[PDB]
């Protein structure tokens, strides 16, 4: 009937071995009209009794206390964790099979939902994935590796871009809008990560972690039901004799069972005191409201009585096992009868059974590399910087010109990385700011000479245009690479987990757009190298030609910190350029220095350089070659300040189209930029 705050609480609290925090759970029961619990499941194979009967016990308690309970069928998560031979279609059969077992397990089907992760994520792709990247952005790679146990894996060592999966599970907490995470203790590390993320985004209400007991494995050298033995677990439609065989050979020491120390990772450690027969009694028999067990006429009302009787040898090992076999066979009976008397359900079960000889000890399937594009197509990522140096920008421009010249049939796309640059924490880590700076840098690059034929795309167009296929590409690429391999890209200097996803996204983008070549600056050649690596030398790496406009200080006398005035940027206005060229280093009778270097570059670009000299200083002259120019600077013939005014003149000229945009179209964005520059006080 009707229940109150205190009896609702006692009931919900009894679900979990641990509850972070008890005060929050109480405040939830008092305040919230409908409480949403959730648990998620990798569809990897026949269902273990823990995910069926034991789960059903705890869900019934949750629904009794006035909760909705969501089953998150984690199809993409099983793909990322290399289940069912990594075949997504087979994983979805297993998922359908799981939903049939849960429907026969006697749960309140008015307050239980069965959601598919892929279906739900793709329906809200913009919301979900932004948060996944935001979680990765704000966390270290070390912190995410520590979540390895939620996948039954070991940190470092083997992780294979199984960094994304924990980031996703965490996103989910918020996505489902769950109030209570009601998963097993081995998930505790990612649940804590979700509570950590509330503090990062300033959300005051945190999800309550109501973690449940991890049910023990049947065989002797293991404290959890595993992938090594089919005999470590009872499956949910095991025949009555298979149930008997498994329980009969089970480890069964005559020792009283005490509660385990809650380890920080949550995964149970193997111990000889842990008796899995008694653990089944405690979790699947005595956890149901009115449950009781009986051996030879005696009826034991609580678990303590049955345990006490077994320790003092009033009940024998074979008697206790025969009691459990009966208790389990009664509980699995409804499930067997459903699969015995339904064509659809029976077919699913047969398909799942066929994957025990159909998907394992056969090399796991992985996404195939697409073939090469027929027409050559180059790709170049815009730097997400407030301050793009002129030398870098010039090299981008020249690389696109050089490509078009070499392949007149072909294409060049500049990608604006408005998703992946947020993920890697490029500026302030804020979407608004990163879009602004990319739009600004795009405009100024065109103003400095980027060909009109160059196509411009955002990640946003690419991703939202292919909501499913893009992220499946990313999952495919991620599965095929060790985390250590992506760590090597940054020489072990990865500052956040978002940088790992950024690398995967770039490759996915290069594949989506059918690119034959990737063009790299000095700032991203480490990332684009991965695209070549992944495609097995199919995609070619073109390097930009930098080093032609140097820093303006004296070589061999650099300041410890480079100031703004020591380097030419492409957002420099008239005042900036005058100021930098004024302070720039040059000296008489010297063949080389930064000013001569900038002049030699301008001479190459414009054909010649005209020094305007009032007579008495030598009058006017043109230099049409660099060798003539350095000779006159070395002889003393050309005074430093004469050259300086000539260089200054040409830099203002080349920058005229750009400086017009700085005062007009881009003035809205540039104001929003220089606030984000100051916001980098740190």
């Amino acid at each position, epitope marked *: 009937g009707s229940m109150n705050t205190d009896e609702r609480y006692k009931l919900l609290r009894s679900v979990g071995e641990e509850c972070i925090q008890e005060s929050e759970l109480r405040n939830l029961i008092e305040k919230k009209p409908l409480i949403r619990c959730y648990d998620g499941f990798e569809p990897s194979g026949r269902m273990h009794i823990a995910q069926g009967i034991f789960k059903a016990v705890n869900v019934n308690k949750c629904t009794a206390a006035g909760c909705e309970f969501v089953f998150w069928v984690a199809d993409w998560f099983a793909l990322m964790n290399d289940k069912v031979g990594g075949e997504l279609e087979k994983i979805r059969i297993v998922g359908r099979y799981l939903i049939e077992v849960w429907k026969a397990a006697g749960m309140d089907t008015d307050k239980v939902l069965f959601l598919w992760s892929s279906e739900e994520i793709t329906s809200h792709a913009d919301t979900y994935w932004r948060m996944v990247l935001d979680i990765g952005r704000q966390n270290t790679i070390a912190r995410i590796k520590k979540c390895c146990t939620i996948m039954g894996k070991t940190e470092g060592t083997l992780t294979a871009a199984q960094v994304l999966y924990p980031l996703m599970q965490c996103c989910d907490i918020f996505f489902l809008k769950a109030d209570i995470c009601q998963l097993g203790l081995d998930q505790r590390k990612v649940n804590m990560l979700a509570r950590e993320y509330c503090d990062l985004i300033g959300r005051k209400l945190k999800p309550v972690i109501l973690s449940h007991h991890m049910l023990a494995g049947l065989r002797r050298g293991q404290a959890k039901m595993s992938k090594s033995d089919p005999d470590s677990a009872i499956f949910m439609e095991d025949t009555e004799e298979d149930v008997a065989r498994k329980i009969r050979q089970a480890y069964c020491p005559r020792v009283k069972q005490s509660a385990s120390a809650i380890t920080d990772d949550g995964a149970p450690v193997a111990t000889d005191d842990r008796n899995p027969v008694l653990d089944y009694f405690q979790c699947v028999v005595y956890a149901r409201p009115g449950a009781v067990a009986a051996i030879d006429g005696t009826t034991y009302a609580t678990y303590e009585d049955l345990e006490q009787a077994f320790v003092s040898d009033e009940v024998s090992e074979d008697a206790l096992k025969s009691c459990l076999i009966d208790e389990v066979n009664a509980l699995l009976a409804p499930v067997r009868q459903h699969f015995a008397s339904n064509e659809e359900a029976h077919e699913l079960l047969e398909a799942v059974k066929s994957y025990r000889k159909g998907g394992a000890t056969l090399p796991l399937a992985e996404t195939a590399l697409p073939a090469a594009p027929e027409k050559p197509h180059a790709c170049m990522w815009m730097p997400a910087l407030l301050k793009v140096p002129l030398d870098v920008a010039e090299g981008m421009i020249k690389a696109t010109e050089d490509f078009i010249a070499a392949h007149p049939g072909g294409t060049v796309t500049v990608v604006l990385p408005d998703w992946s640059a947020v993920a890697s924490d490029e500026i302030t880590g804020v979407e608004k700011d990163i879009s602004a700076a990319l739009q600004v840098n795009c405009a100024l690059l065109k103003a400095y000479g980027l060909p009109n034929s160059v196509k411009i795309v955002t990640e946003n167009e690419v991703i939202l245009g292919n909501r499913n296929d893009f992220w499946v590409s990313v999952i495919g690429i991620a599965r095929k690479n060790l985390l250590s391999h992506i760590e090597e890209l940054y020489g072990g200097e990865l500052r956040n987990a978002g940088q790992v996803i950024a690398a995967l996204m770039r490759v996915a983008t290069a594949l989506m757009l059918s690119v034959s070549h990737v063009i790299s600056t000095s700032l991203d050649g*480490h990332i684009n190298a991965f695209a070549r690596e992944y495609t097995k030398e199919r995609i070619e790496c073109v390097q930009t030609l930098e080093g032609r406009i140097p820093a303006l200080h004296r070589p061999g006398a650099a300041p410890a910190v480079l100031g703004a005035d020591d380097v030419l940027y492409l957002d420099d206005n008239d005042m900036d350029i005058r100021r930098k060229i004024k302070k720039a280093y040059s000296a008489p009778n010297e063949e080389a220095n930064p000013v001569i270097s900038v002049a030699q570059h301008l001479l190459a670009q414009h054909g010649a350089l005209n020094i305007e000299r009032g007579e008495a200083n030598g009058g006017n002259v043109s230099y049409n070659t660099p060798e003539a120019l350095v000779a006159d600077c070395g002889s003393g013939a050309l005074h430093p300040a004469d050259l300086k005014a000539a260089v200054l003149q040409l830099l203002l000229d080349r920058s005229a189209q750009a400086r017009a945009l700085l005062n007009g179209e881009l003035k809205k964005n540039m104001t929003a930029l220089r606030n984000a520059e100051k916001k980098m006080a740190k």
Partner: nanobody
Amino acid sequence: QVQLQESGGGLVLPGGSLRLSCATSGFTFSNSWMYWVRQAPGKGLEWVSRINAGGNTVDYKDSVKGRFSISRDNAKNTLYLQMNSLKPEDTAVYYCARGLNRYAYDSRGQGTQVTVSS
């Protein structure tokens, strides 16, 4: 092949200073990242600073930030490390290395010894 030769090392007192230089050949220095790395006695190689082609992007190991300065002359194919306010912890063989990209280097010169002791 790639050749790199360092010079400028020696013995100084704490609070002293030096300027290392590296002369290079056999590759396109002017379009390459370049590194300074060091090896203290019974320790691994560790990078000290690095600089991109245009001399506009520079990084420094925390312990030398504000005291050391890296620069390059692309015309002369030489790299420079100005070391000021030297400390005993800076004692090491300093090497000049070719950068493949921002986070990696390969070829190294023979090295120049730097010692800071009273």
